[PDB]
């Protein structure tokens, strides 16, 4: 149903980095937690990567082998990632766990992936090395080996020549958590990654003069590719900020855009809302954001009302018209695959209620089909299917999954939406629909509406529907985290949530469950995974709290 013509490029990642070294002008600027800065030119990165690569070789890690990445320090992660790229070693970046002595999904993912990949070596930093080894000994994991990047930097560097690689060979393996069970390992070739890069650059007119800024964790595809490898491909300046720095003080994102004259940046929808929360203090200070021309809202459903408010607040801070770029992407397509032309605030009205995520990059084709795999007419909801050189060819060691989601040269994303004049509009995700009396409801709207309320902490909210067997009816369940200091003072807001939702939508939440911030399940990028919360409810993990709240009501 779509298009885009792109000339074949047969570069590898090593050639891309080698091309970038000539521009000793540019490279990576690392922002530390204390807001100090450290510049590493592409030449320095290349030299650093070679040293680490030699360290890897000396430990017996060979071409084609896989290594797990568990590195929180950005100054260690990127050089180690590129080290693997140059040596033909496949890096497997995984989310750094919040702790390694307590039960969490990140610890489970690390152990599961480790088992799937036949006991590969784990790369860490000096801060985390001890904790990760402890987990290995405590859980008696046979062959568990962890090494710091700084120990690999010590390797007497007997550097030999770099291997010549096939761009069709695997270069990057990224595991995503599925709805249930084992994680899914997305295989990404050089050709996959560089075909996204080329398509995105040509379509959006990026040049070596760009300044990219990332504040998402480096294990995610958006940070590795769109705001990592792309910048290397362009040989432009790239900046990496730890997520917690911007979370602790959201306005620092705006400060860094101004200070570094940033032209390209990205966050999911919730972070836009976090800025909107700062509307008051944004009246007493002024930022200059005129350098920002490509501001990506991607990673989760985009809220019309949130974007509209974001423009109104920040146009008073020199944010140019059409700078905001809602986009669609996934791990399976090396992040971004469609890009908006920009928002003009005229599509944002009590409008749609769906934001356009734009047209696909050159080389890519997208379509909306029915259950029969037949293309549907424009403007009606169906399953999104994607193809092109930027799209993955298959998952790691999972034929059952490959045969299901890869058919006729198309990949089923598991996402729902429609096409209108060539532009993609995502409406929801499969098996997460909120249907009550045949009427379609949309989680993001509900969540946005909830998050307007005082006492509801932004980015910890979820809305989903379960079927109640006893009463033979569908229930709307709302989970949130209180903005109180602290819970359980967030009992007053439970009542406030139910009424506010009824007033605006005409339907009510059956249950409203407050949650401790640390227990709301989130992907590395901060997207609330509603599947894990649905399961938790059906156990039920919250039954005690539900009763306790119900006992507090009726008094
Ligand atoms: N703009 C969007 N609107 C609605 N849902 C989205 C959007 N972007 C991503 N998603 C959801 O997130 C899923 C992919 O999740 P992950 O594999 O964890 O990686 C991601 O979250 C990528 N979407 C990140 C990205 C995209 C574009 C540019 C930069 C960065 C998609 O299948 C879709 O369900």
- For residue 87, the CA-to-ligand 1 centroid distance in Å is 30
How far is residue 392's CA from residue 194's CA, in Å, rounded to a whole number?
12
Ligand 1 near 185 CB (within 6 A):
no
Q: Verify whether ligand 1 is closer than 6 Å to residue 523 (CB atom).
A: yes
Residue indicated by tokens 């989760």? 300
Overall resolution, Å: 2.5
> Which among 298, 392, 423, 425 is the best mutation to test ligand 1's pocket, defined by most ligand atoms within 8 Å of the CB?
298
Find all residues with CB under 8 Å of 471, minimum gap 6, and list them: none
Ligand 1 contact, 19 CB (< 6 A)? no
Mutate to test the pocket of ligand 1, among 176, 228, 268, 299 (most ligand atoms within 8 A of CB): 299
DSSP-derived 3-state class of residue 153: coil
For residue 522, what is the DSSP state? B
Q: Which atom of ligand 1 is nearest to the CA of 413?
A: 32
Domain 1-430 sits in CATH at: 3.40.50.12780
Helices (H) and strands (E) in the chain, counts: 18, 25
Query: Could you give the C-alpha distances from 292 to 229, 264, 324, 349, in angstroms and in order?
Result: 20, 6, 9, 24
CATH 3.30.300.30 in the chain, residues?
Answer: 431-555
Q: Which tokens sit at 66?
A: 């896989």
Ligand 1 pocket check for 287: Cβ under 6 Å: no
Contact 522, 300 (CB under 8 A): no
From ligand 1's centre to the CA of 132, what distance in Å? Answer: 29
The finding on whether 415 has its CB within 6 A of some atom of ligand 1 is yes
List alpha helices for 217-292, DSSP H.
221, 230-234, 243-248, 252-259, 269-276
The CB of 417 under 6 Å from ligand 1? The reply is: no
Regarding beta strands 406-407 and 410-420, do their DSSP bridges make them parallel or antiparallel, or are they unpaired? antiparallel
Provide the β-strand partners of residue 467.
474
Superfamily name and number for 431-555: ANL, C-terminal domain (3.30.300.30)
Distance 525 CA to ligand 1 centre (A): 10
Which residue puts its alpha carbon closest to atom 14 of ligand 1?
A: 330
Residue 386 CB–ligand 1 contact under 6 Å: no
Largest CA distance in the chain: 76
Residue 176 Cβ contacting ligand 1 at under 6 Å: yes
Residue with tokens 């009205």: 349
β-pair type (146-148, 184-189):
unpaired
| Residue 552, burial from CB neighbour count under 10 angstroms (0-12, 13-18, 19+) | exposed
- Say yes or no: CB of residue 336 within 6 Å of ligand 1: yes
Q: How far is CA 120 from the centre of its chain?
A: 25
Q: What is the DSSP letter of 372?
A: T
| Straight-line distance from the first to the last Cα atom of the chain, in angstroms, rounded to the nearest whole number | 58
If one residue of 329, 334, 418 were mutated to test the ligand 1 pocket, choosing by the most ligand atoms within 8 A of its CB, it would be: 329
Residues of the chain with CATH 3.40.50.12780: 1-430
The β-bridge partners of 434 are 441
Element (H, E) at 146: strand 146-148
For residue 298 and ligand 1, the question of a CB distance below 6 A is answered with yes
C-beta 432 within 6 A of ligand 1: no
Q: Which atom of ligand 1 is nearest to the CA of 227?
A: 29
Would you say the C-alpha torsion 337, 343, 347, 353 has a positive or negative sign? Answer: positive
CB atoms within 10 A of CB 529: 16
CA dist list (Å): 238 to 219, 283, 356, 439: 16, 30, 27, 46
Q: 492: which DSSP letter?
A: H
For ligand 1, the distance from its centroid to the CA atom of residue 390, given in whole angstroms, is 15
How far is residue 103's CA from residue 36's CA, in Å, rounded to a whole number?
33
Helices 13-21 + 190-204 axis angle, to 10: 50
What spacing in Å lies between the alpha carbon of 172 and ligand 1's midpoint?
18
What is d(CA 82, CA 27) in angstroms, rounded to the nearest whole number? 13
Pocket test for ligand 1, best of 330, 354, 386, 532 (most atoms within 8 A of CB): 330
Contacts of 63 (CB under 8 A, 6+ apart): 87, 88, 89, 163
Q: SS in 3 state form for 392-433?
A: CCCECCCHHHHHHHEECCEEEEEEEEEEECCEEEEEEECCCC
Question: Distance between CA 517 and CA 34 in Å, rounded?
Answer: 24
The token duo for 187 is 């295989």
The sign of the dihedral angle between the CA atoms of 300, 305, 306, 310 is: positive
Structure-block tokens of residue 510 = 């059956």
User: Rounded distance, CA 308 to CA 315, Å?
Assistant: 11
């Amino acid at each position: 149903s779509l298009g885009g013509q792109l000339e074949d490029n047969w570069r590898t990642l090593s050639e891309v980095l080698e091309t970038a070294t000539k521009h000793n002008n540019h490279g990576i600027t690392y922002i530390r937690n204390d807001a100090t800065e450290y510049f590493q030119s592409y030449q320095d990165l290349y030299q650093d990567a070679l040293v680490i690569l030699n360290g890897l070789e000396q430990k017996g890690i060979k071409l084609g082998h896989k290594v797990i990445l568990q590195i929180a320090k950005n100054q260690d992660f990127i050089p180690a990632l590129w080290a693997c790229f140059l040596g033909g070693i496949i890096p497997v970046p995984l989310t750094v766990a919040p702790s390694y002595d307590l039960e969490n999904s990140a610890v489970k993912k690390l152990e599961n992936v480790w088992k799937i990949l036949d006991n590969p070596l784990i790369l860490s930093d000096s801060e985390l090395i001890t904790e990760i080894e402890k987990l290995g000994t405590y859980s008696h994991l046979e062959g568990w080996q962890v090494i710091s990047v700084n120990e690999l930097r010590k390797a007497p560097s007997k550097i030999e020549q770099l291997p010549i690689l096939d761009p069709q060979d695997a270069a990057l393996l990224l595991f995503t958590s599925g709805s249930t069970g084992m994680p899914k390992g997305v295989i990404l070739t050089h050709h996959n990654i560089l075909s996204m890069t080329a398509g995105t650059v040509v379509m959006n007119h990026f040049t070596q003069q760009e300044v990219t800024l990332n504040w998402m964790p480096l294990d995610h595809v958006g940070a590795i590719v769109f705001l990592g490898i792309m910048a290397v491909d362009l040989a432009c300046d790239q900046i990496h900020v730890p997520m917690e720095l911007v979370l602790r003080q959201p306005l620092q994102w705006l400060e860094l855009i101004q200070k570094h004259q940033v032209s390209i940046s990205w966050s999911p929808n919730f972070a836009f809302s976090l800025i909107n929360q700062q509307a008051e203090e944004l009246k007493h200070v002024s930022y200059n954001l005129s350098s920002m021309k490509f501001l990506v809202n991607a990673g989760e459903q985009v809220s019309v009302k949130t974007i509209r408010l974001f423009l109104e607040i920040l146009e008073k801070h020199q944010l140019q018209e059409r700078a905001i770029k809602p986009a669609f992407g996934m791990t399976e397509s090396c992040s971004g695959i469609t890009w908006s032309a920009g928002l003009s605030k005229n599509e944002l009205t009590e409008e749609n209620s769906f934001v356009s995520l734009g047209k696909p990059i050159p080389g890519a084709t997208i379509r909306i089909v029915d259950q029969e795999n037949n293309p549907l007419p424009e403007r009606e909801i169906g399953r999104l299917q994607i193809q092109g050189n930027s799209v993955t060819k298959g998952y790691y060691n999972n034929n059952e999954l490959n045969q299901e989601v890869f058919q006729e040269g198309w990949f089923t994303t598991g996402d729902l939406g429609y096409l209108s004049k060539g532009e993609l509009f995502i409406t929801g995700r499969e098996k997460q629909e909120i249907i009550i009396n045949g009427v379609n409801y949309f989680a993001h709207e509900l969540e946005t509406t909830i998050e307007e309320l005082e006492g509801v902490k932004v980015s910890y909210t979820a809305a989903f529907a379960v079927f109640d067997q006893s009463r033979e009816t569908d229930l709307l369940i709302i989970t949130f985290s209180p903005e109180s200091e602290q819970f359980e003072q967030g009992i007053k807001v439970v009542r406030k949530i139910r009424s506010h939702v009824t007033q605006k939508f005409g339907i009510a939440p059956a249950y409203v469950i407050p949650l401790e911030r640390n227990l709301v399940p989130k992907t590395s990028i901060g997207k609330v995974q509603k599947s894990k919360l649905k399961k938790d409810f059906e156990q039920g993990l919250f039954s005690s709290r539900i009763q306790e709240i119900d006992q507090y009501l009726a008094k």
